[PDB]
Each structure stands twice: as structure tokens, then as C-alpha cells.
Amino acid sequence: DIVMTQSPASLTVSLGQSVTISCRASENVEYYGTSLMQWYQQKPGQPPKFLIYGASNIESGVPARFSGSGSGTDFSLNIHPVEEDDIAMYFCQQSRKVPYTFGSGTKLEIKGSSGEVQLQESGPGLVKPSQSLSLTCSVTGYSITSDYYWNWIRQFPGNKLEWMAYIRYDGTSDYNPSLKNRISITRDTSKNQFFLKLNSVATEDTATYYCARAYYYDGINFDYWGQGTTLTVSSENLYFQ
Amino acid sequence: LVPDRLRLPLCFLGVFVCYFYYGILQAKITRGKYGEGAKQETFTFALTLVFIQCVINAVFAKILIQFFDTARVDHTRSWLYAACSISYLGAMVSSNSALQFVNYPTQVLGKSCKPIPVMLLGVTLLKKKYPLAKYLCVLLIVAGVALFMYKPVGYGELLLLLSLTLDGLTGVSQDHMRAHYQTGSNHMMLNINLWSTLLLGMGILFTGELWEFLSFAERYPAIIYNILLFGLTSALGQSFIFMTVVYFGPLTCSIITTTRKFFTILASVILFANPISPMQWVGTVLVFLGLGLDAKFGK
Ligand SMILES: Nc1ncnc2c1ncn2[C@@H]1O[C@H](COP(=O)(O)OP(=O)(O)NP(=O)(O)O)[C@@H](O)[C@H]1O
Numbered sequence A: 001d002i003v004m005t006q007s008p009a010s011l012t013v014s015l016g017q018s019v020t021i022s023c024r025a026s027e028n029v030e031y032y033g034t035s036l037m038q039w040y041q042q043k044p045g046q047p048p049k050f051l052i053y054g055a056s057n058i059e060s061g062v063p064a065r066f067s068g069s070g071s072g073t074d075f076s077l078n079i080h081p082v083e084e085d086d087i088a089m090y091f092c093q094q095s096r097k098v099p100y101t102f103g104s105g106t107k108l109e110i111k112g113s114s115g116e117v118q119l120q121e122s123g124p125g126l127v128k129p130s131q132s133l134s135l136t137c138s139v140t141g142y143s144i145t146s147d148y149y150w151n152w153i154r155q156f157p158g159n160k161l162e163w164m165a166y167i168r169y170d171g172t173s174d175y176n177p178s179l180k181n182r183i184s185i186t187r188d189t190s191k192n193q194f195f196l197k198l199n200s201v202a203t204e205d206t207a208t209y210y211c212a213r214a215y216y217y218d219g220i221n222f223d224y225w226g227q228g229t230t231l232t233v234s235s236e237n238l239y240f241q
Numbered sequence B: 001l002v003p004d005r006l007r008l009p010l011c012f013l014g015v016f017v018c019y020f021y022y023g024i025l026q027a028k029i030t031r032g033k034y035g036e037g038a039k040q041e042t043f044t045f046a047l048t049l050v051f052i053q054c055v056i057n058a059v060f061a062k063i064l065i066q067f068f069d070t071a072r073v074d075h076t077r078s079w080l081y082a083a084c085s086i087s088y089l090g091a092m093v094s095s096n097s098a099l100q101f102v103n104y105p106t107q108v109l110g111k112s113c114k115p116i117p118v119m120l121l122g123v124t125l126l127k128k129k130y131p132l133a134k135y136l137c138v139l140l141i142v143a144g145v146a147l148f149m150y151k152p153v154g155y156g157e158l159l160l161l162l163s164l165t166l167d168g169l170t171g172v173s174q175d176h177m178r179a180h181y182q183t184g185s186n187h188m189m190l191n192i193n194l195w196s197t198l199l200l201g202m203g204i205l206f207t208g209e210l211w212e213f214l215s216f217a218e219r220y221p222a223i224i225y226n227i228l229l230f231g232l233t234s235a236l237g238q239s240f241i242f243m244t245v246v247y248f249g250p251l252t253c254s255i256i257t258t259t260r261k262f263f264t265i266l267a268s269v270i271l272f273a274n275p276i277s278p279m280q281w282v283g284t285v286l287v288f289l290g291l292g293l294d295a296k297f298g299k
Helices: B008-031 B046-067 B078-097 B115-124 B132-149 B158-180 B185-204 B210-219 B222-247 B250-272 B278-295
Strands: A004-006 A010-013 A019-025 A037-042 A049-053 A066-071 A074-079 A089-094 A106-110 A118-122 A133-140 A149-156 A160-167 A173-175 A183-188 A193-198 A207-216 A220-225 A229-233
Touching: A004 A089, A010 A019, A019 A089, A019 A106, A037 A066, A037 A220, A049 A066, A049 A220, A074 A089, A118 A207, A133 A149, A133 A207, A133 A229, A149 A220, A160 A183, A160 A193, A160 A207, A173 A183, A193 A207, B008 B046, B008 B222, B008 B250, B046 B185, B046 B222, B078 B158, B078 B185, B115 B132, B115 B158, B115 B250, B132 B250, B132 B278, B158 B185, B158 B222, B158 B250, B185 B222, B222 B250, B250 B278
Parallel strands: A010 A106
Antiparallel strands: A004 A019, A019 A074, A037 A049, A037 A089, A066 A074, A089 A106, A118 A133, A133 A193, A149 A160, A149 A207, A160 A173, A183 A193, A207 A220, A207 A229
């Protein structure tokens, strides 16, 4: 699978300066002259926010400050008039191959320091190893039978994102080939929910799970995100801590 | 899995080989003799032939998808396929219906000018950009092909212009689909052919084609045989047609499909040493020069 590398682990910049974050792919991510690249922004304790698709197209509603550039296996995201608002971790994602991958994430810090779709996830917070787990994402204000992809993603400690799987409104589902044997995604249109079931969860599975809504245009774009649900896999019952 | 360098040659060879037999069998079927004398009952159900060809191509595309290139979601919106299908069908209908109204540019300009509109439309709708060298190469290729094919109030000629415009719109739709939704060649072919099959089936439910062609075929079962082979000759021939357009674009597909006839005629003449007219030397030279400049020094 394509491996995304973000050269600057953490950038220290002053207000008003121009910042360039570099992301590189192990293989060419161009598909007939279009770069299948996306850039997202994640503030602390918040779901990632969709910024750019196609490596150059700014998402509607994003300020004009952000801009994307590059081609082939090298891309960059530029914010010339940076302010305090654009302080977050920036992730680069490739939609060239089915196992969509996110970059390690670049942290940007300052010196001296019914009208929409709502997603809500539920599930147990603590699970013993080797048990079976089932998370539920409930959609309100919209129907999961309309033209939108419904994806499950998980962020490990250290902010390393990983796209588990998704189910299209047609019922067609795609899985991460690594996890295809362990997880299963289902839906229930009557309650307007969709569930992700994991079998034999190990200690490695500890992460924060988001359920997101995405639309495919020059690559898959996780435009809307849920609030994320924490999952902790441990061999001891967390009490008085 | 094919080398990139040997990609375009493969598509050109495939289309050139397939469509020659396609045309031969289309002539053999449409002309026909069937009954004797007044019993001839000449074949007049062209729409039924197009419908059968479309369904055969759809079946072949489904076979290809199921057996090869599996595990790949379409990602393309259905309405785009519907739009492409309607544009294709309208262009084909208008082209077939302009025969009995134009004499001098009777397929001399109706075809051999296929690329220009597409290219122009791509410049206007999708705001694409090409170097002036590409413009000159396309114009030279068009002029050479048109001058090579020449054979020893303008009210009804609007139909040919409408056909060319619809072809350009179809090319624009295909380019948009391949650029944004990363649609595969087989998926595009299957969906477009399914939509065209639906449209044509709705069209021929009128007694003129279906309930007449059925009885006529019952009268002369032999035609079925040829029909079947013709369908196959389209499928392969269509496959490459829907592959190159994905790999190199509708403009390249149009150039290939419009210069295929000239290349075939030139090769046949060379093999048979037929005395091509001195004037046509100009057309072939222009086409060759345009292709050469397109490949290099202005590509
Ligand atoms: N963009 C395209 N999409 C779908 N099919 C295409 C496309 N371009 C070409 N084709 C096919 O390839 C053919 C190229 O033209 P041609 O082989 O001359 O057919 P035609 O319209 O019947 N002209 P002719 O055979 O001389 O009467 C079309 O008729 C289609 O069958």
C-alpha cells in the first residue's frame, strides 16, 4: 500500500508567516492527469476537518489562505497569511488505492505558547482482549440510503489515522485489506444507523473511532465527521483512576 | 497489465483489426439478399441492429468485469452515464438520418471532422488547454483525411452539424467522467451500453422495428448467425474504443477512429499496389505530417 510521509514533524512559526507542509507518497498518485490527494485539519480533541481535495481544489467554505500544489509523488500545502485559527495537525491522504492512508500528521504551533448531517457513535469504552466488539453510528438529519459514502476511521494514540472500511448507500462495502478478515460493516436503514463489528480485539486496537460521511470527487473526501468514541482494550478493569 | 510505451500501439492495432471485419459484416448483413426477386424483403431494421449490438456489448462488458478487473467500485454517478448515452444515441441517429439530405459533404465532412468539435468542446466546457501545435496537428489530420476520402440553400444539412455537436458533448462527458470519478473503461462501456440499450428498446417497441424484425428473422434464420458474429466483432472493437478513451482521452480516441479508415485504405492499396489518385497523395502526406508533429515537436 502507498505510504505517506510528512517531512516536518512539527513546525514552529510566527503569526503572519508563510508555512509549507510537505507530503510524499511511495508511488505516483496521479490517475489520468489528476492528483488524488486530500488535506485535512484536526484541532486538538476534535475530528479532522476537510480542507482540500485533488491537491489544488479548496473545499467550499475554507478560507482562501489555504492552497495546495505539487504533482507526482510530492505535494505541499501552503498557508501564506497564517493566524491563530490555523493551529492544528494537518494530514495528507491519498485516494489512489483502496487502502486509503493518511500521513503521520504535521503539528503547527506558535512560538511563546436539521439543516445538516449529524453523526453520533456509541459503544463500550472498555473491552477485554479477544472479545467481540460492535460500534454503532447513528445518523440524524439525513438518510443513509442517499448518495453518500459512510466510512469508519480510527485514530491511534500519536494521531496516526487509519481508514477501516465504508458502506455505500447502494449497500456496496469496501474494507481495508489488512483488516478485511477481522472487521465487518453492516447497516440498518430502518433506524438510520450503521454498525462496525470487530472480532478478537487485541491491545493494539486501542484508538478513537470516528464515523464519517464522504463524497467521491477527485478522490474520497471525508467531508463530515462524527465526534469520535474512545475504545480501550486492557486486561484489567479500570477502577479508581 | 501492458507496458506504457506499447500501450497506444496496442489500442490502434486492436481497433484497426476489429473494425475492418465489423464493417465487412455490417455490409454483408445490411445489404442482404434473402428472398428472390420481389421476395427480397431487403433489411431495413437498422435500429434493431444497433439495439442488438448494444445488448451484446453490455453482456461482453459484464463478462469482462466479472472475470477480470474485479474488486473495484464504480464511483461514477448514474446520471453521467445516462447523459453520455443520450448524447451518443442522438449523434448516431442524426448521422444516420443525414444521408438523404447532403451530397458533397456526405460523410466527407460529417466524418473526418469528428475531432475538431470534441477538441473545441473540451476547450469551452471543461476549460482544457492544448498547445497551438496540437491545434495545428488536429487541423492537418482532419484536412488530410477529408481530402483523401473525397470521391468523384443548405436547409437539411443542420442535422450533420447537430450530430457533430452531440459527438463533441459525448466526448466532453467522457473526459469529465474519466478525469473526476476515475471511471474504468469496462464500467463506462457497460453502463453506457446499458443506458443505450434501454433507450433503443423503448424506441423500437413501435411496430416498425421489433414486431417486424422478429418475423423477418423467423423467415430467414441464417441472418442470425451473421448477426451474432457481427455483435462479437463490435464487442472487441468497442472494448479498445472504450479503453483508449480512458487511457489517452476522447480526443485521441477520435483521432484514432477517424484516421483508421485512411490507414486501412492506404495499407490495402500498398498491398495490392492499387494506383491511388495523384491528388490523394497530398491528403496522405498531410495526415502523416500532422501525426508526426503531434507525436513530437509540439506534442
Ligand atoms: N466515444 C465513443 N464512445 C462510444 N463508441 C464510440 C466512441 N467513438 C467511437 N465509437 C464507436 O466507434 C465507431 C467509430 O465510427 P465508425 O466506425 O465510422 O461508425 P459509424 O458511425 O457507423 N461510421 P460508418 O461505419 O462509416 O458508417 C462509432 O460508430 C462507435 O460504434
